[PDB]
């Protein structure tokens, strides 16, 4: 049973890679030669009290800082952010946080993200140097097949 979260680094299909600017996680060409941000993952205790068939429920977040990512509602649309946040802490809840949890999909080589509280809404990459987003649009102007490279 997994004891520490997995670390690595996450891409999308026009291999622009996920790295931290100022505040704020932003997609750029892994050609940049930029720092990747490492992404930390790990699998949430409770996948039956969630929706089954969506993908497994995971909290995602970002070392070197430590924060969570977070699907926030103070507007109309949910939004995604970064928290302040020890992923162990989520992890040790004794029940699913549901706005830092997100459904991991897997077909062939990449993976979806869909936020557990907002359904049907994605983490999403767009044109270089743009922040990773909350879309509930997909296939059009989005990338939201990532590869994640960590070690499953």
């Known amino acids: 049973s997994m004891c520490k979260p997995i670390t690595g680094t996450i891409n ?3 291999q622009q890679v996920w790295t931290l600017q100022g505040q704020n996680l932003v997609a750029v060409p892994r050609s940049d030669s930029v720092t990747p941000v490492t ?7 409770y996948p039956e009290a969630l ?3 969506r993908g497994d429920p995971i909290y ?4 070197n800082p430590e924060m969570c990512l977070y699907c926030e509602k103070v507007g109309e649309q949910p939004t995604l952010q970064l928290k302040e946040q020890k992923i162990m802490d989520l992890y040790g809840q004794p029940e699913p946080v549901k706005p830092f949890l997100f459904y991991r999909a897997k077909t062939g080589r990449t993976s979806t993200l869909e936020s ?3 359904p049907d809404w994605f983490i999403a990459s767009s044109k270089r ?3 990773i987003i909350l879309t509930s649009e997909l296939g059009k102007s989005y990338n939201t097949a990532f590869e994640l490279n ?3």
């Open 12 to 14: 999308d299909l026009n």
């Open 51 to 53: 929706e089954q068939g």
């Open 150 to 152: 960590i070690n499953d």
């Open 60 to 63: 995602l977040g970002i070392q």
């Open 39 to 45: 992404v930390a993952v790990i699998t949430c205790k």
């Open 116 to 118: 557990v509280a907002f």
């Open 129 to 131: 140097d743009q922040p």
